[PDB]
Design a protein around this ligand. Structure first.
Ligand SMILES: Cc1noc(C)c1-c1cc(O)cc([C@@H](O)c2cccnc2)c1
Length: 123
């Protein structure tokens, strides 16, 4: 069974729109979103659909690009580091749950490489 997806809004959370945050959405996320390996990360893991019932028994801090996209679109973050942290959590979760020689890990590693490439050009 799946937990509630991570929050994309929090009225009592302090928010702020920075040039770095705009770049993370308009450039970083938008480009990664269109990558041939991006589709498994565009929405939370469905432990039932994927026959991975133990996923949310192992991953206690889930994250996906769909959540990050909504957070960016909702101006949920205070600075770029908060958004970058969500990306790092998404990748880390994948490497934790899956075996190093798995297709999904190869997809994550490719996206992580492109992600690191793009944040090295952060404004
Ligand atoms: C991301 C993630 N992190 O842990 C798991 C598990 C996933 C995942 C998410 C999906 O939406 C689909 C699949 C699976 O169907 C697949 C996808 C691609 C290659 N080989 C297998 C895996």
């Amino acid at each position: 069974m799946n937990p509630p997806p991570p929050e994309t809004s929090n009225p009592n959370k302090p928010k702020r729109q920075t040039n770095q945050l705009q770049y993370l959405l308009r450039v970083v996320l938008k480009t990664l979103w269109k990558h041939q390996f991006a589709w498994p990360f565009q929405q939370p893991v469905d432990a039932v659909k994927l026959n991975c019932p133990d996923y949310y028994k192992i991953i206690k801090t889930p994250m996906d690009m769909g959540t990050i996209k909504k957070r960016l679109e909702n101006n949920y973050y205070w600075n770029a580091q908060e958004c970058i942290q969500d990306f790092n959590t998404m990748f880390t979760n994948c490497y934790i749950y899956n075996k190093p020689g798995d297709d999904i890990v190869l997809m994550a590693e490719a996206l992580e490489k492109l992600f690191l490439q793009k944040i090295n050009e952060l404004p």
